[PDB]
Design a protein around this ligand. Structure first.
Ligand SMILES: *[C@@H]1O[C@H](CO[C@H]2O[C@@H](C)[C@@H](O)[C@@H](O)[C@@H]2O)[C@@H](O[C@@H]2O[C@H](CO)[C@@H](O[C@@H]3O[C@H](CO[C@H]4O[C@H](CO)[C@@H](O)[C@H](O)[C@@H]4O[C@@H]4O[C@H](CO)[C@@H](O[C@@H]5O[C@H](CO)[C@H](O)[C@H](O)[C@H]5O)[C@H](O)[C@H]4NC(C)=O)[C@@H](O)[C@H](O[C@H]4O[C@H](CO)[C@@H](O)[C@H](O)[C@@H]4O[C@@H]4O[C@H](CO)[C@@H](O)[C@H](O)[C@H]4NC(C)=O)[C@@H]3O)[C@H](O)[C@H]2NC(C)=O)[C@H](O)[C@H]1NC(C)=O
Ligand SMILES: *[C@@H]1O[C@H](CO[C@H]2O[C@@H](C)[C@@H](O)[C@@H](O)[C@@H]2O)[C@@H](O[C@@H]2O[C@H](CO)[C@@H](O[C@@H]3O[C@H](CO[C@H]4O[C@H](CO)[C@@H](O)[C@H](O)[C@@H]4O[C@@H]4O[C@H](CO)[C@@H](O[C@@H]5O[C@H](CO)[C@H](O)[C@H](O)[C@H]5O)[C@H](O)[C@H]4NC(C)=O)[C@@H](O)[C@H](O[C@H]4O[C@H](CO)[C@@H](O)[C@H](O)[C@@H]4O[C@@H]4O[C@H](CO)[C@@H](O)[C@H](O)[C@H]4NC(C)=O)[C@@H]3O)[C@H](O)[C@H]2NC(C)=O)[C@H](O)[C@H]1NC(C)=O
Ligand code: ZN
Ligand code: ZN
Ligand code: ZN
Ligand code: ZN
Ligand code: ZN
Ligand code: ZN
Ligand code: ZN
Ligand code: ZN
Lengths: 210, 210
């Protein structure tokens, strides 16, 4: 019946690059028309804060308003497991709605990042697959990119993180490049972002072995 | 309000091994108590069939019955895209409920299966990762297993299928073995089941390269 609140973490890579600006987004839906006005309270670890930016309310094609409040989080605060509560109040609910969010909890484990060259049997086609193996990481939040002399290789696909038998995650990234490039001798680098890396970043280069 | 019908495909590997017995399962839920009796109709491509086996009805801890009907499908019929309709009738619904199911549609593409040996940089620890790369397959339904001299290696994890830039899927399987075994010279084989393989099966062996 009453409104419903949803609270969304920042983008993983906004949290891992200190130059970016991570945000937590509080969304209330099913805002009626009779009792439309809603109040946001915000708390960082149970202490009230006032720097949130609420958006002007919008009307939905089901006879309902939508109101979003955005709060910037600090890079260190997010990574240090600080907890972000959004309180939503409306003279229509029996009581207020509270939703709390933080970064995935758990002891962090630093990834091991490995590059693997094409298979022997695959050395037949004109396009080949370059493999990044990333293993032993925790939490599951991660980002992977491939690059070659400055520019980005964007012909890649990365698997979702897979929960591994020790409680850590792994994944693979597959870079597809024209084979002549592999033989020419191009440098290809898989670059990984994860909290548990030094400065949340590492790079591994792959090359035609002599 | 009325009952709800759900219709479930067979297990992927039941469909890929001709010795097994795939089944489609029709589940109706929200069966009331006042109007409890339900009738299953079944059709293979719009033609009625009578070999389904309905289970004796069970009562749910929300004041509702659950009734399941199971229909065996033929191996060839399933793989040839035959369509399986379950009709559910009850003197309580404004009208009957029909749900139709078949194998994932689309032109089949045969996987390319590749085994990759541990990374140079990973050759430091006492456990190593063996990689099966399976690529270019369609539909996404697939099964992967590792084995060594007869017995199954069960210390493996396989990624979900990832949709690749050409419309085909890929995935990787990661076999973890003690490093001494890699150096001793053990044969390790990744065995893949997919519709588009000859007899829905192939095998690729991986060994310490000399
Ligand atoms: C009236 O219409 C209302 C909507 O208006 C309309 O517009 C459309 C939605 C359309 O569908 C029309 O219906 C209509 O015209 C409608 O409101 C809707 O209600 C639903 C439920 O009642 C809501 O469903 C929830 O959705 C969540 C995900 O929503 C995201 O994804 C969808 C698309 O996939 C999208 O529509 C949403 O906008 C939202 O997108 C995300 O938005 C945030 C904020 O912008 C982004 O994050 C930010 O991104 C920016 C840059 O964009 C930047 O990166 C910031 O840093 C960052 O913060 C995301 O990027 C963005 N994602 C995407 C993909 O775009 C679901 O998670 C939620 O699931 C929950 O409940 C499920 C069961 O329903 C359950 O399965 C699930 O577990 C989950 O439960 C919670 O969550 C945890 C799991 O994650 C659990 O562990 C917990 O148990 C539980 N939480 C707790 C503690 O309780 C759910 O499905 C729907 O979002 C909402 N629609 C909108 C638009 O808000 C309303 O219902 C209608 N009225 C009536 C009468 O019904
Ligand atoms: C009263 O209580 C009822 C239940 O009794 C109780 O028991 C529990 C369920 C408990 O939760 C208690 O609540 C209660 O005590 C309750 O009924 C429930 O209603 C729900 C919806 O109203 C149903 O939800 C649906 O579930 C589907 C998946 O269900 C499977 O998985 C769950 C566990 O994850 C499990 O509980 C189910 O039993 C079922 O398991 C699968 O079962 C089949 C059959 O056995 C197996 O297949 C067979 O397996 C055998 C060997 O086991 C062999 O291999 C055979 O070959 C093979 O056939 C599976 O192996 C098995 N899986 C698992 C993991 O065990 C969801 O898919 C479904 O989603 C649909 O709707 C969603 C939104 O709700 C939507 O997101 C989604 O897209 C989807 O929509 C359809 O599907 C397509 C996507 O796949 C879409 O493309 C289509 O658009 C759409 N279809 C179309 C064409 O319309 C949904 O969530 C719930 O299952 C049901 N509970 C049970 C137990 O049946 C009832 O609601 C209560 N009453 C009231 C008043 O509410
Ligand atoms: Zn304030
Ligand atoms: Zn807390
Ligand atoms: Zn380090
Ligand atoms: Zn930092
Ligand atoms: Zn009959
Ligand atoms: Zn049809
Ligand atoms: Zn073949
Ligand atoms: Zn066959």
């Amino acid at each position: 019946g009453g409104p419903s609140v949803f609270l969304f973490p920042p983008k993983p890579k906004d949290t891992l690059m200190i130059s970016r600006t991570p945000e937590v987004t509080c969304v209330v839906v099913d805002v009626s028309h009779e009792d439309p006005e809603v109040k946001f309270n915000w708390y960082v670890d149970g202490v009230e804060v006032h720097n949130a930016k609420t958006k002007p309310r919008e009307e939905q094609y089901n006879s309902t308003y939508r109101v979003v409040s955005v709060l910037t989080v600090l890079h260190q605060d997010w990574l240090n497991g600080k907890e972000y509560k959004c309180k939503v109040s409306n003279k229509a609910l029996p009581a207020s709605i509270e939703k709390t969010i933080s970064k995935a909890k758990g002891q962090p484990r630093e990834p091991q990042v490995y590059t693997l060259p094409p298979s022997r049997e695959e050395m037949t086609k004109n396009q080949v697959s370059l493999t990044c193996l990333v293993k032993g990481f925790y939490p599951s939040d991660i980002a992977v990119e491939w690059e070659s002399n400055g520019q980005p290789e964007n012909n890649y696909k990365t698997t979702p993180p897979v929960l591994d038998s020790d409680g850590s995650f792994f994944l693979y990234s597959k870079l597809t490049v024209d084979k002549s490039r592999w033989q020419q001798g191009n440098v290809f680098s898989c670059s990984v972002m994860h909290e548990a890396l030094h400065n949340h970043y590492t790079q591994k280069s792959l090359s035609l072995s002599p």
